[PDB]
Design an enzyme around this catalytic site. Structure first.
Site, short mmCIF file in Angstrom:
data_model
loop_
_atom_site.label_atom_id
_atom_site.label_comp_id
_atom_site.label_asym_id
_atom_site.label_seq_id
_atom_site.Cartn_x
_atom_site.Cartn_y
_atom_site.Cartn_z
N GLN A 19 -34.40 -22.32 8.43
CA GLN A 19 -34.41 -21.25 7.44
C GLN A 19 -33.09 -21.10 6.70
OE1 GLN A 19 -34.74 -18.32 10.91
NE2 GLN A 19 -33.77 -17.10 9.31
N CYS A 25 -37.09 -15.80 8.82
CA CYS A 25 -37.70 -16.24 10.07
C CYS A 25 -39.18 -15.86 10.14
CB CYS A 25 -36.95 -15.62 11.25
SG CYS A 25 -36.89 -13.78 11.18
N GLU A 96 -36.69 -15.96 -5.06
CA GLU A 96 -36.88 -16.19 -6.48
C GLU A 96 -38.20 -15.55 -6.88
OE1 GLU A 96 -34.12 -19.42 -8.05
OE2 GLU A 96 -34.32 -17.23 -8.09
N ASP A 114 -54.01 -9.01 16.14
CA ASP A 114 -52.87 -8.54 16.91
C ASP A 114 -53.23 -8.53 18.39
OD1 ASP A 114 -51.21 -8.16 14.68
OD2 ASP A 114 -51.88 -6.08 14.43
N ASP A 137 -36.01 -10.19 20.41
CA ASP A 137 -34.62 -9.77 20.26
C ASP A 137 -33.75 -11.01 20.44
OD1 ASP A 137 -32.08 -8.66 20.33
OD2 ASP A 137 -32.43 -7.54 22.20
N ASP A 160 -36.79 -3.49 20.41
CA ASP A 160 -36.04 -3.69 19.17
C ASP A 160 -35.93 -5.19 18.92
OD1 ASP A 160 -35.11 -0.80 19.94
OD2 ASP A 160 -34.42 -1.11 17.87
N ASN A 187 -38.12 -22.36 17.28
CA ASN A 187 -37.26 -21.59 16.39
C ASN A 187 -37.22 -22.28 15.02
OD1 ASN A 187 -35.50 -19.49 15.64
ND2 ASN A 187 -33.83 -20.11 17.00
C1 LIG Z 1 -35.26 -13.30 10.72
O1 LIG Z 1 -34.88 -14.37 9.87
C2 LIG Z 1 -35.29 -11.98 9.98
C3 LIG Z 1 -33.88 -11.47 9.69
C4 LIG Z 1 -33.79 -10.48 8.53
C5 LIG Z 1 -34.25 -9.10 8.96
C6 LIG Z 1 -32.37 -10.46 7.96
N1 LIG Z 1 -36.03 -10.97 10.73
C7 LIG Z 1 -37.07 -10.30 10.22
O2 LIG Z 1 -37.48 -10.46 9.08
C8 LIG Z 1 -37.77 -9.31 11.16
C9 LIG Z 1 -38.80 -10.05 12.01
C10 LIG Z 1 -39.70 -9.14 12.84
C11 LIG Z 1 -40.92 -9.90 13.32
C12 LIG Z 1 -38.93 -8.56 14.01
N2 LIG Z 1 -38.41 -8.26 10.39
C13 LIG Z 1 -37.90 -7.03 10.30
O3 LIG Z 1 -36.84 -6.70 10.81
C14 LIG Z 1 -38.72 -6.02 9.49
C15 LIG Z 1 -38.48 -6.26 7.99
C16 LIG Z 1 -39.25 -5.34 7.05
C17 LIG Z 1 -38.61 -5.35 5.67
C18 LIG Z 1 -40.72 -5.72 6.97
N3 LIG Z 1 -38.34 -4.67 9.84
C19 LIG Z 1 -39.10 -3.87 10.62
O4 LIG Z 1 -38.83 -2.72 10.90
O5 LIG Z 1 -40.20 -4.53 11.05
C20 LIG Z 1 -41.11 -3.74 11.86
C21 LIG Z 1 -41.55 -4.42 13.13
C22 LIG Z 1 -40.64 -5.05 13.97
C23 LIG Z 1 -41.06 -5.61 15.17
C24 LIG Z 1 -42.39 -5.54 15.55
C25 LIG Z 1 -43.30 -4.91 14.72
C26 LIG Z 1 -42.88 -4.36 13.52
#
Ligand SMILES: *[C@@H](O)[C@H](CC(C)C)NC(=O)[C@H](CC(C)C)NC(=O)[C@H](CC(C)C)NC(=O)OCc1ccccc1
Length: 220
Positions: A19, A25, A96, A114, A137, A160, A187
């Site tokens: 990535q 991810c 983009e 789910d 995590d 978390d 990964n």
């Molecule tokens: C990994 O590349 C990436 C890093 C960025 C956050 C910089 N991680 C995620 O996108 C992450 C993956 C999930 C599966 C844990 N997503 C989030 O953190 C998510 C993003 C939003 C904008 C959709 N935030 C969030 O609160 O997701 C809710 C959630 C988390 C875990 C389980 C169920 C729901």
């Protein structure tokens, strides 16, 4: 269920991807699960476009390199009627404007499932469905430096999660502490990380790093 599963041996899993420096991810987890289910359906393994998801699945709730969810990606593929191949829409690790072309769509789904928040249920899904999208995590230095063996981080959180990955199987190996079971996880940090891009994550240790907390797969 079986005591060992490895969907790589059955043709369900593309090579390890990278990535880059983009928080995408979730897109790599989503394409990995959909690659597996498309293979289940058609018998053909086609690498799918994470960039398509980064650029285009905002309306489903995703935020490009600033994060996303695999289920929102599965919803996009359904809502959108397709997803382009990796070859046709390659990965650039920056957000983009959307350039989806239906002519180059190679994958579809009709929703997602789910999995109950239990490692027993995750095991049953891995054993019977294929690779499963999960969140973990991964925010610990121990995860960056992982070389081999079963990864166990005492300070890992089961609620978390911050990193989406792909469970391609599970298994066991004898260890000093007799915590011998692991999830086999693909990964998206390239081949040089971990064991050829993979990690063996502690299994049946109180939902370690939350791996059973947000597990799902697309319906093909
Ligand atoms: C990994 O590349 C990436 C890093 C960025 C956050 C910089 N991680 C995620 O996108 C992450 C993956 C999930 C599966 C844990 N997503 C989030 O953190 C998510 C993003 C939003 C904008 C959709 N935030 C969030 O609160 O997701 C809710 C959630 C988390 C875990 C389980 C169920 C729901």
């Amino acid at each position: 269920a079986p005591r060992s599963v490895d969907w790589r041996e059955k043709g369900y899993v593309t090579p390890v991807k990278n990535q880059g420096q983009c928080g995408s991810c979730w897109a790599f987890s989503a394409t990995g699960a959909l690659e597996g289910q498309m293979f289940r359906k058609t018998g053909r393994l086609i690498s799918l476009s994470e960039q398509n998801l980064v650029d285009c699945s905002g309306p489903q709730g995703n935020e490009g390199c600033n994060g996303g969810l695999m289920d929102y990606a599965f919803q996009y593929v359904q809502d959108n009627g397709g997803l382009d191949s990796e070859e046709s829409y390659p990965y650039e690790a920056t957000e983009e404007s959307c350039k989806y072309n239906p002519k180059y769509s190679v994958a579809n789904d009709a929703g997602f499932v789910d999995i109950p928040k239990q490692e027993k249920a995750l095991m049953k899904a891995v054993a019977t469905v294929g690779p499963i999208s999960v969140a973990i995590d991964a925010g610990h230095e121990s995860f960056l430096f992982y070389k081999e063996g079963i990864y166990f981080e005492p300070d890992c959180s089961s609620e978390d999660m911050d990193h989406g990955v792909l469970v391609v199987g599970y298994g066991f190996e004898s260890t000093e502490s007799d915590n011998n079971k692991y999830w086999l996880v693909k990964n998206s940090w390239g081949e040089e990380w971990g064991m050829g891009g993979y990690v063996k994550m502690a299994k049946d240790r109180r939902n370690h790093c939350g791996i059973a907390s947000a597990a799902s797969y697309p319906t093909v």
